[PDB]
Amino acid sequence: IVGGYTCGANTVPYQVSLNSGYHFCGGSLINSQWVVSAAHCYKSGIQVRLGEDNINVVEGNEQFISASKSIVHPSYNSNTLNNDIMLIKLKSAASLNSRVASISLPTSCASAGTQCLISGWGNTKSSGTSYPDVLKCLKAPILSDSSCKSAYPGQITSNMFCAGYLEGGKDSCQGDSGGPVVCSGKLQGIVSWGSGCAQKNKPGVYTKVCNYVSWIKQTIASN
Numbered sequence: 001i002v003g004g005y006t007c008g009a010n011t012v013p014y015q016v017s018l019n020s021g022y023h024f025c026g027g028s029l030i031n032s033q034w035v036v037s038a039a040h041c042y043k044s045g046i047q048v049r050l051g052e053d054n055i056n057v058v059e060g061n062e063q064f065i066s067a068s069k070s071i072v073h074p075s076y077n078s079n080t081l082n083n084d085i086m087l088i089k090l091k092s093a094a095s096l097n098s099r100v101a102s103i104s105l106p107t108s109c110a111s112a113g114t115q116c117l118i119s120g121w122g123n124t125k126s127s128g129t130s131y132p133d134v135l136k137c138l139k140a141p142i143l144s145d146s147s148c149k150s151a152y153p154g155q156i157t158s159n160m161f162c163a164g165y166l167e168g169g170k171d172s173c174q175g176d177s178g179g180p181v182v183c184s185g186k187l188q189g190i191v192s193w194g195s196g197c198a199q200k201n202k203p204g205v206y207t208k209v210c211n212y213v214s215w216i217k218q219t220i221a222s223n
């Protein structure tokens with residue numbers, strides 16, 4: 001997260017870190033046995049780490065659960081990142097409490113101007129790599145479709161939305177991938193891609209979760 005702030009231990013209880021011997025993507029807990037992340041974060045040997053704040057130290061509240069299976073959207077395209085969403089089922093259910101909780105899926109899509117919270121352990125430098133130990137947060141607005149499409153001509157599908165600042169300085173970045181964009185208590189986006197990080201006129205692009213709620217409910221119901 002570039003230009004963000006320290007969220008504070010366990011203030012984002014649905015945030016999860018996907019770990020394969022190191023933190024490589026974020027994710028969101030949506031029920032005690034399922035997590036939603038980005039299809040581009042797929043890999044085998046994923047351990048889901050819940051209740052995390054400092055990812056390099058055990059300080060209490062963490063639950064490390066192995067993924068039983070990851071379900072990448074059947075129509076995911078890695079060259080366009082269209083349908084960039086993946087569901088991960090946990091080997092056992094997580095214990096939910098105030099530090100570990102799920103986030104609700106949206107009943108409606110959010111409008112431009114909606115302010116959302118984006119969080120992650122991704123890079124905090126737009127030029128170079130600085131990875132924090134603790135969870136960073138950023139409050140960003142969803143942009144209008146015209147500004148999004150004007151920023152990435154021909155690269156935005158209807159399953160993507162842009163959120164961020166065109167002046168630059170504040171944005172999600174590598175390492176934040178797969179994580180949550182929550183607006184009004186609902187999971188509205190998944191950190192997907194962008195050109196560089198916090199670059200002027202290059203806002204972040206997010207998977208539009210409201211378009212996948214029936215797919216998520218149907219897939220969880222049959223697995």
Ligand SMILES: NC(=[NH2+])c1ccc2[nH]c(-c3cc(OC(F)(F)F)ccc3[O-])nc2c1
Binds near residue numbers: 177196198203205
């Ligand atoms: N500017 C953004 N809002 C943004 C968001 C997620 C990203 N994820 C990545 C990303 C970058 C990776 O390494 C690469 F820069 F060499 F391509 C690898 C995985 C990523 O998800 N870049 C990203 C940029």
Ligand SMILES: [Ca+2]
Binds near residue numbers: 052053055056062
């Ligand atoms: Ca920790």
